[PDB]
Structure formats: C-alpha cells, structure tokens
Design a protein around this ligand. Sequence first.
Ligand SMILES: [Ca+2]
Ligand SMILES: [Ca+2]
Ligand SMILES: [Ca+2]
Ligand SMILES: [Ca+2]
Lengths: 97, 93, 93, 193, 1123, 48
Amino acid sequence: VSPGQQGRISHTDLVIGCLVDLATGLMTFTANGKESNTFFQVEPNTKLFPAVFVLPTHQNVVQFELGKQKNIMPLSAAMFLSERKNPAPQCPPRLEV
Amino acid sequence: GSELESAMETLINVFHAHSGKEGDKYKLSKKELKDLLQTELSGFLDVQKDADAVDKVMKELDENGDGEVDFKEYVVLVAALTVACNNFFWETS
Amino acid sequence: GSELESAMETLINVFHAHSGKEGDKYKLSKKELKDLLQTELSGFLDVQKDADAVDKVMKELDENGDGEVDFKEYVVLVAALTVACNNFFWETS
Amino acid sequence: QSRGDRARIFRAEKSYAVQSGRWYFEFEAVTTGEMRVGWARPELRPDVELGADDLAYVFNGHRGQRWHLGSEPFGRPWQSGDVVGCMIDLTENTIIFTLNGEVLMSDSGSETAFRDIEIGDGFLPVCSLGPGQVGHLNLGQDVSSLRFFAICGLQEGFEPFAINMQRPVTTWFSKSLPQFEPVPLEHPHYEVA
Amino acid sequence: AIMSFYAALIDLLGRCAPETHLIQAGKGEALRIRAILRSLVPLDDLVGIISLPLQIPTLGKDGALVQPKMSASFVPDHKASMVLFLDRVYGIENQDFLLHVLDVGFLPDMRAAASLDTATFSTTEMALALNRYLCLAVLPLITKCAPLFAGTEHRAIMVDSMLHTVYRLSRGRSLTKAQRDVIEDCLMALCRYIRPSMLQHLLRRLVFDVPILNEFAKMPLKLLTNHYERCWKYYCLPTGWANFGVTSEEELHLTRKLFWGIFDSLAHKKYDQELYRIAMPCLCAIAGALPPDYVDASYSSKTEKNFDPRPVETLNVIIPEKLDSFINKFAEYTHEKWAFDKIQNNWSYGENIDEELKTHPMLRPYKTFSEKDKEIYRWPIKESLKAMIAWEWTVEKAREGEYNPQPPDLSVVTLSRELQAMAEQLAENYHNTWGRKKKQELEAKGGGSHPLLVPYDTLTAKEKARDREKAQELLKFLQMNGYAVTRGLKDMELDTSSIEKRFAFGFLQQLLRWMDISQEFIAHLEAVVSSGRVEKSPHEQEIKFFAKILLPLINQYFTNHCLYFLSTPAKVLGSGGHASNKEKEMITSLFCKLAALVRHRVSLFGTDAPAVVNCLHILARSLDARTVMKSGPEIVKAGLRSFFESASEDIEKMVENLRLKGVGQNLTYTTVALLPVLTTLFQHIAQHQFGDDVILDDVQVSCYRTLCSIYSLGTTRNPYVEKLRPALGECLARLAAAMPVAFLEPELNEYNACSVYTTKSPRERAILGLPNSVEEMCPDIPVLERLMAEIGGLAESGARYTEMPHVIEITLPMLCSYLPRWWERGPEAPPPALPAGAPPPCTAVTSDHLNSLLGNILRIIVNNLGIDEASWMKRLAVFAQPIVSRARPELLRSHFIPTIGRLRKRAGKVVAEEEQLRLEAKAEAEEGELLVRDEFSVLCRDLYALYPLLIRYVDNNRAHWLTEPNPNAEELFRMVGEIFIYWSKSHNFKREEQNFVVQNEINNMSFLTYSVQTSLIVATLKKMLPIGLNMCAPTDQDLIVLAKARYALKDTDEEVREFLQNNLNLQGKVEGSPSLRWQMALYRGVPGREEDADDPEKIVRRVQEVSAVLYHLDQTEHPRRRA
Amino acid sequence: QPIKEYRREGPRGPHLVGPSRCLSHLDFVPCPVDTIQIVLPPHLERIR
Ligand SMILES: [Ca+2]
Ligand SMILES: [Ca+2]
Ligand SMILES: [Ca+2]
Ligand SMILES: [Ca+2]
C-alpha cells in the first residue's frame, strides 16, 4: 500500500501474486504486477500450502484466484499430477478453503 | 386476592363488634348502628350530624321493619355506596 | 375510624388493577372477571372448573345486558359472598 | 489465554452413548477451583464452554451452579476431596447431582437438577477442568472403588456407567493444538463460494 | 359506486371465509371454500389496493381546506374490506410478508393519519374516516400479528418508524375512546414482543413526553412498566439478557433521566389516586432495572428543565472588539478547515461550484475571501460569543492567537471538564436554533414534530456529536487564541466522586431528605391529633406521596438489590458490584430513622403501618452492620446504638406493664413492629455472623437487658402473657443466636475476647451503668448446667405444657439456638487455629449436652402426644431442627424407636376405629365420623411434629446405616413403612393430613430442606426406603416383583406371605443374568451377610415388607361460590 | 516434571489435569507504577 493512499478507503482492488519456482526452490511476490523485493528460499522436498491471514474489514474479504500469467503454469498443474502439463487453470472439487 | 378476602374479614369484624357492643345478639339496633357508623366512616358519613337521616336509614335498612340490621342488608347497600363514591370521583368527581 | 374506608380502597385498587391489565381499564369484562376471580379466591371458588360458568354468571350479573360487570353489581355480589362465608363460619361445628 | 479454549474437556467416547436406563458415575475434585461435570451429547463441540450450549448439562463446583444454555445457581460449592456423583435417569429424563453422597437441591428445593431431557443422540460422561485443576473420573469399572454409590444410587437402581465394560472406557479430550479444517458449509459468519 | 361495489364484494367473500378453528380441524369443505376464495381474489391485488394512496386534505389555496368529496373518491372504508379479506382468507404468517405489506400499504396510511391529526385537519371527514379504518381493520391485525416482530433487526429503521408513528397517533386528539384503546393495545402488544434494543428511540421520546405527567402521559407509564419489567435482565446484569445483548451507556442514561423526572414530577404534583397507583409500579420497575452502581458519563448539577424550541437569547447582548477579533480568527480558521475538507474530497479552486468539476469559487485566500461569505462565516461565531456572554461565561485573553488550506490544529488542543461542558451547552444552543428553524417550518406545514426536535441531551451520543463538532471546535479555538473562561462549575465542585454519582447514592440521599420531611409532618400530625384536631393537613400531599410511593419503592428496590448492599469489597456475594461504605452508612441511617419514625407512633400510620413494618424488615435484611461498625460516622454509629437502646427500653417497659393510654400505645407498638423487626435484625446478624463485630459495648448491655427482661416476663404467668409468649420466644432465640457473649457460661466469660468486661477497662464500665461482676449483668438467667439439670428433671417427670408453659415456649428455643452457635466456639469442635496458640474456649459446650437436650425434647413431645391442642409443638419442632444435625447415633434406639412406635400403635387403633365406623352405616356412620376425623387430625399434628427431627437425623446417619447393616434401622424402616401403609389405606387420613398442613400454614418443603410429594409421610418413607432395599438381598427382587402383583390383586398380607412361602424356591439365579453377579459381589463384600438369607421365613417376611412399601409408594406416585 | 501433561497417576487412579498456568518472559520485567509526574508537597517533604 502506498503511503499516500494509506489512511484512505481505497477505491481500487489489490492483487498479490505469489510465484514459486520449484526447481530452484525460490519464491517471489508481485504486487499489482510490480515486483516486490521480498523473496524466499526453501529446501527441496518441502510442501507449501497457499494461505492468507486476514482481519475482516468489509463484506468482501479476499479471493483466491488460480490464474496464469505469460509462460507460467497455474497452481492446479503443480497440485495434481494428472494436470502436470495442462496449462488451462483448474479448481477441482478437492481444492477448497 | 387474599387481601380482598381480608377485606371481607374486616367487614365481618366491624359488624360483630357493634352487634355485641350493646349486646344485640348479632344485629344492629338503632343505637349500635349509629355508633358503628360514626366510628367506621368518620367524615363522608353522618349520623350524629344528621339524625333525620339516621331515622330514614333505620326505616330503609329495616325494610323488614325489625329495626335491627343483619349482615346482608348493610353489606349490600353500604358497600355499593362506599365503593361507588370513588367511581364517581374518577368519572367526574 | 377509617378502617372500612381502608377496606373499600383496597377493594378498589384490586379490582381496578385486575380490570386494566386484561381489558378496558375500569369496568369488568368477562375475561377480566375470570382472571380476576382466579387471582381473588382459591380453595373456595367452584367456578374454576369452567370459564363458561363465569360467562353465564357474568350474563346474569349484567342484568343491564351490556356484557360488562358494573362495580356496584360486583361489590354487591361479593357482599353476598361475604354472606356465604359467614354462613360457612356458622355451618362449621 | 482465550477463555473459549481455556478449560480442557474430557468426555467418554461417542460409541459409549447411553440411550436408556439409569446410569451413575463419580467425580472427585482434587482441587476446589473451576470444574464442571455432567453429561454431554455425542456432538459436543470442543471450543464452546460446557453448559453454555444446549449440547451439555453440567454442574460447576467452584461457584455452585448448574450450567445448560447458561447458568443458574444450584447446590453448594465443594471442598477439596469432595466427590460429586452424577446420575442420569433416562426413564424419567432427569439428571441428579449428589455431593459426598447427599443429593444437592436447587433453590426451589427440587431434587432433580435437570428435567425434561430428550434422549436424542444419547449422553456421555464429561468434565471440564479450568486451568490448574485436578479431578478424578470414576466410571465404575471397579464397582467397589466407588465411594458414595452404596449410600446414594445403589438402592435407587442406578448403574455404574462402566459396570460391565471389561476394558477401561476410552476418553477424548479437547486438544488445544490449532489445526486447519474445511470451512463449514453452514458457518454463521464466513462464507466461501 | 364501482369502488363501493368491489369493496362490498370482497368484504362479503372475506366474511364467507371459514373460521380458523374449522381450518385447523381440517374440515375438507372449509379448506375447499378457502381455496375457492383464494383463487377468486389474488393476494397481490389486495396488497396493491392497500398500497394505493388516498388523497388527503391540504391547507392550499390561500390557507383553505381542500377536502376531497368523500362520496366521489377513494375512501378508507374501501380498504377496510380489503384488509378484512386479507386477514380472514390469506392470513399473515410470514415475517417477510408482514414487513412487506406493512411498509408498502399500512405505514403510509398511519403516517398520513398522524400528519392529519393537526388542528385544522383534525375534524375533516377524511381524517375521521382514516381513524375509523385504522382502528377497525389495521391496528387489530398488527396486534394479532405482533409476535412475528421478533428478530426483525434487518428492518430496524422501519420498525422504529412504525413504533414512533403509532405512538404519535395514540397521542393524537379527536379520537373516540374505543379508538384510543385500540391504538394503545396495539402499542403494548408491539412493545411486548419487539426486542429491547429496538425501543431505544421510542424510549428517548418518552423521556421527554412522560415527565409532564398529563392525562395523555398515563399510557406511557404502563408501557414503560411492562417493558422494564420484561427486560430488567437486559438492563442491570453486566452480562446482559440471554441472546439480547446488553444495554448501552446512553440507554442507561435515558433510564436514569426518566426515573428522576418521574420521581420529581410525582413528588411536586398534588395527590391523584389513579396517577399514583399507576406510577408506583413504574417507579419500582425502573428502580429495579437500573443498575445499582451505574454512573452517568455526564452529570448536570444545574439539572436544567409540548416542546420549547426558542433558542438561548444572544442578539440582545453586544459583542466586544476582543471577541470580534476572535470572531475573525475563527472565521478564517473555519474557512481553512472547510478548504481542508475540500482537499480531502479532492475539491479545488474554481469559477463556480460543480460536483463533477470538483472546484469551488469561494476556495480563495481569506484576503480575497468575499465579505458576504465572510459575514456568513462570522455571524454564527458572533451568536455563539453573545450566547456565552448571556450565559455569563467570561472569556479573557491570556495571549493573542497564533488556495492552500492552513487550518490551525485542534486535535492536539484538549478541553477540561468545564470546557467539555461548555461545548455541550454551545451545541445545545446551536440545536435550539436548529429547532427554532424547524419550528417555523412545522408551523408553515401545519403540524408534526421533527425527529431532532427532541432535546439535544436526550439525542443519542452520536447524534449529539453532530452539533458537538462545531461547539467543541469553537471552544478549542477560544482556548488556543487564549480565552480562559470559567463560571464556577458546581459540577467540578462536586468533582467526579464516582461513589456519590452512583445512582443508588442519589436515590438514598433523596430518600433521607424525604425522611427528614417525614419526621417533620409526623410531628405535625402528632401535634394536631394530640390537640387542636383539624383537617387542613398542609403536608397531606407529602404524607400521601410518602405512604403511596416511597414505602413500596423502598420495599421493592431493597428487596431486588439487597445483595448489592451486602456484598463486601473483598467478597462479592452478589452477581457483581458492591456498595460503598458510605452507601452502607446511609442504609443504616435510613433504618434507624425509620425505626424512630415508627417508634410509639404506629397507630397514627394505621393501615399504612403494616407496609411500614414490611419496609423495616426489608431494610433490616439488606443492612450491613459489620462494615459500618468497623468504620463509619460516629453519628450513624450512635443512631444504631440508640435504636438498640430504645428497643431495650421499650421491651423492658413492656415487661413491667405486662406484669401489672401511653402504656397501651407502647404495648401495641412493640407487639406489631418492634418485636418482629428486632427478630428479623437478629436473624440477619446470626446468618451473616456479624454478631461478634456488631454486638459490642452499649449494644451488648442493651442485649443483656432485653434478654433478661424477656426471660423474667416468661417466668411470669398471665393469659395475655401466654398470648405474647410465641413472639417473645422467637425474638429471644434470635437474640441468643446473635449474642457473642456466652451469657449462660459466666464462669468462663473471662476467656471470651469479645465481651464487654474484657474490652472495657476496670476504670471504664464504672462510669457506665455496668455491674462489677458479670454474674450480676442479670442473675435471673440460670447457668447452663442448672438449666440442663432442670429441663432433664421436668422431661423425666413428663409434666404437661400447661404445667411448664414458659419452658417450652421460651427456654427451649433459647437453648436449642444457643448450643449450635457456641458449639464451634467451644472445645470438641474443628479447631482451625489449633497449630497457633489457642486461648481456652469461652464456652464449655460439648456434643453430649446437645444429645441430652435432644433426648429431652423428644421426651416432652412423646409425653405430650395425644393432647387436643399442642400448637406450640410445631414451633418447638422447627426451633429444634438445628440441633439434630449433631445427634449421637444411640438416640435412635434410646428415644426415637419407642417414640415412633407409640404413634404407630395409635395409628393402628385409630384405623381400627375407622374400619368399625365404615362397617357402621347411616346415622351410625355419621356419628363418630367427626370423632375419627378429630383423632386423625391430632395424630397428623403429632406426626408432623415428630418427623422433621427424624428426617434430619436420617440424613445424617443414612450414610452409616447404608454402609453397615443395622437391625435397629431395619426395624425403624418397618415401622415407618407401616405408618405409610396406614396413610395410603385411609383416605380420611390423607384429607386430614392436607387439612392440617394447610390450616397450620406449615411450610412443608422448609423442613425437608401442598402436594402429596411434599407430604412428610411419603417423604419420610422415601428417605428411609433405601435402607429397606439395602437390607434385602438382590436375588429376592423377583419375589418383590411377584408380591407387588399380588398386592395389585389386593390379596391379604397373610395371603401374600403364604404365596411367597409356597413359591420360596422361585429365587433368582446368578447365572441367569450378569447384573446379579456384581450385585452378589457387593452384597458379599459388605460383611455379616454370610448369616443373611439363612431362613426362608426371613426371606418371605423381608420381601413382603418391602413389597408392601413399594406397592403403596407406586399408588401414591402414580394414580361453593359458584353454587 | 513432564511437559503439558493432561493425565497423572494417583492413589485411586488416573487424575485428569487441566491446562497449567505458564510464566511469560514479560512476567520477569519489573514494572512499577510511574511516579515522575508526582511532585512532593512541602508538608509531605518535611515528613519525607
Ligand atoms: Ca347486634
Ligand atoms: Ca332490618
Ligand atoms: Ca374492564
Ligand atoms: Ca351489568
């Protein structure tokens, strides 16, 4: 959140995209498309669950979007072995909050 | 309630008191009746102040003409008047 | 002094309070009277078994044919009930 | 710590729910602090306090109260070492709580602590031990071990809850380690679409 | 004509609709008819018709009345038929549908009627028709559907609007009495079922409406009474009423405001029977609901004040040049702050104001700021400062005050309590100006009340904030520019003083002031009755207020909140909150003042005296003596001591007069008030263990005088004395319980730390009237040992109650209440202080003394059995219940068993008489029927007398008996069971049981801690039955099962014995069922049972006894005014 | 001692034990009530 917008009820929606490169064990985060410095490194064979910690402040709290940017696989492909090479986003019934 | 029961009890108490005050068995002579009246209802009621009223009330109470009053007669009429007074008070005055 | 006035004012408080909560603020409707009697007397009344008995007693007690028990009529009836209770006292033996 | 989680609940296993009969068990309070004991339905929720919901009917000792969908003064507080005998009569749909072999009475003087209970799923022995408290739950697997059963309950025909269970009764407790669970479809506040 | 026809057709169909009872019963014909009607008339069309608007008269055309031609337009009577059809046929059951129709079609109608209620429009034909339509069709429907309003928070604004509209319509004039009654009934029906939090705004209106106490105000009294009585939980409990949240600070403030307004208005107003009788329940209800310790966030010492909207006069005064400089500074500050709001909104400077353009022409520097707008900004400030001057608020410059907005910051600058109050009154003046503007608007419109017309203080805190922003902004700008301002706040003079600000504090202070007024007019009444009798009675208003309101208010409030006044700060007995030491002090002051008021003056109060005495009892119950005695004003201490001393004087004065107008007055006063109130006070002291702290020094001396005078009176003999004996005995027993000095053990008194002699120095208590030696405190009272030896001797003699009337009535209660209290203080008791150095106990009481005592009482009652009248006996039994707890086991064999056995024999004899009477017939039956009735009555009296002791004894020793077999206990079981058999067999016995328990006002459950379950006989049998079951063998239960069947068959006792004898080999088998296995295990584990079941005769007799008990127990558990 | 135990052994049988009070690192920080704002009245300084 920008310091100027800070303290104001923003009329926009914030989008935070969390990227993980499994081969390199690396994680990065992009805010509204702009890369953020915060990066993480993980050991091989680690299991990570997508997560969100929120204090509700409005009727519409948050939304998990399972999208795909250019040349980046969606989450379902990593999550399910059958979809290992499927690039179309999916949210099968097993996936739930 | 039991308070209204006690109200009837108070009526009976006052009645038997003056029924035996002069020894008139259980029935109010003219003298017992007069003394009773100016005792129970001091103010709104008059017997000493209105002796002609006392005599007319002797005749009216004693429609039987006995001159003595048992429980039924005065309970009916005295209760009617003494309660209706406040009903008029609320209505107009 | 004013003990009969005290009894009478207690009577007024009780039956007016029992009239107001249930219906028209002052007089005695049928439902008012039924609940009122329930409040008034226990262990002596035989009307508890049927409210239709209360209804018909109300009908008679309303010789004026209005469906509402006048205060004078109610007080005279409860004076007759004082009569019945004194008869109960004598019957005891 | 959060009070909704502050007290540990120990209950019998769901498979031991009693549908009918007259059952008895004992609960000795090694400490006088906050401790509840009674009967809970099999669908008891760990996070909600005992007796603050319709699921459980219990007696809290430190204050001398009976809890079900709230609190109402009832009985008297126990001292350390006192044994609360809990009885349930499903033929009459009542719950009785006795202290040191004497039947506790509510303010009105009624002997039955709770009345007009629908059998439903059943009922299970349950206790809640606030922080820093110790209790002893005797389910009657060894009938002689009971302290006040003969004095109260035996002649009334009540049964030790585990009189004929050759193996000890299994218990489940309110483990306070947070874990992730799917969002309930009927959650009052949070909706996932 | 066409509307009339269609309305008449719909009305006819609705009338044809079947009745609800037929619909519920499910009569196919009725359901078919209702379906036909529903098909004929669509519901949505009815809703539309109800929605359709009715032209309402207007004051147009130069103030003329434009009233539509009734016969030529759409009229409410037409909608009445629609409503009737909708109710009878479709009915209202869905909350959503109720709200929908209410909002769309009804609520506009009641709004219109309320609006038309004004003077010009009041009598219009359309207005009268609307009143008729509402009161005949709409209001009754809402009253019927009222319960649906529960849980309607989602439409809270609409519900609140409905409540306000209905209340306004109720106030409306020109209504017929029936119409007003219907509207009021709807209001109560809605307020009963609607949630409490909903009533916030309505109650806010009522806070202002009711205090006037006019004729239109009476219905609000009932409404508030009902609402507060229903929701008292929600208002006082810290937790709040279940599922309904908790009250708000503003709501509690409104509650307190309403309470005090009603109190003051009622006190000032002259007497009115109806108004007072309606008020007292209301005042009691709010008093109970309001929390005892609640403290208002804001308090007004000035306590200022249909509505007056005229603003505080400011134009009259002039404005100094100093304040004009401040006006310019605040004008530029306000311009800058408005420009800051504009920058927040993204507005900038422009040529004109346009929402889309987001630019402003006046957003220009203060130098170029136009004069006209400059005057606009300044004039409110001029008015505010002139208002300050008119209020006499004096502002002094300590120092001078210090496009792109540049607003001086106000957040950093704060305001003291004075300045916060000043901001409040400035916002009040601004709101009054606003209300004056609304007043001109409402005058033009012709009526109505703006929702904000209600006083600013009454307005919600958030709503008050709306005007408070500008008020507090001006105050802070004053402060920064250097204006110091002060008017000498009586509020700050009072200071926060949270203890004083507690509601209970103010209530009690007002009560004490009224108490001084009571002393004044009682003195006046006493003087006039003594001489110069006259009927003016100028204080008559105050007298009637006192008696009618204050005394019942005292009773209800101090009964509902007794716990809060007793809970100590250290230990909180109540749910929450504890009274202050000062609050306890005023409680004590009130108690003493009331005792003094009623002293020797009961006859003057007359019919009000019983209520006064009840108030005395309640205050005594709620009194906390220990705290005040430990710390409290010497004046209140002396008041309590003077109450005690005067009580002692009065009771001794009794004593000598009894031994033989003022004397009779003292006699009646003591008989009616002093003795019972003193009894209650002593009982409270004993229950709370306050005795050691409270009864000291002069209090102890007064207590000694009271005790010894009572005892001497008891020794004296007279008929009126024996009349008084019961109350004297109860009072002296309570006094013995309270007493902290072992008066019965003077020889060991020196050990008692809490004694007058030990506390006071030898040089002391000589200036006081104290005997040198404790024995001479009063010699008449015997020592404990001699009392015990005597009571034993008389008990052995077995003399009669008449022979020793004083003993049973006084000495026995005294002694049985004495032993328990001093047992713990004496040896042989749990010594909590054993590890520390323990002084020798002041008393020498031991459990053997109590055991001997109890044996004595048993002997006296057993001797007195069979006498015609022993009314003292029940009192003796209740007084003797406490001792039984510590009775030694051997008492059961020594005294109880023969005692209850004699009664069993008497029961056998009397039932024999009963069967002989039954054989006798007609006049023979009638003669002796009353006889046997009398024997049953006396036997029942003795039976109740004996049991409670036996019950309490059983409770103590049931553990022992059930742990180890007891032949004596088994015999007792047999005996009590036989008594119960007689009870069940004899119907006359049961009716006489009921007659006694009812006539003698016995509280049957109290002894256990009126129904058959409550009946002692069945209670005793149930309490002992476990022993009967225990002494039996588990195997033999099948034999009992068969014996109960035989008893249902009604076989003779010998017949069932022979049945079991011939069926003796039908015993249950352990192998047959497992339960019998652990039954057998426990049975063997208990010792001494190897000799059990040795004889089939034992088996059959045991089974028969138990079966006879169970069968009758099962029978028991499961079965003229009109003339 | 064991850590976070809910069961214990005893004379008659197993004892169920509730949650245990735990000390917090902050509990060791000594926090007295602030007194800097307080200034001594002379009548109290002479007594001081
Ligand atoms: Ca006579
Ligand atoms: Ca006559
Ligand atoms: Ca009425
Ligand atoms: Ca009539």
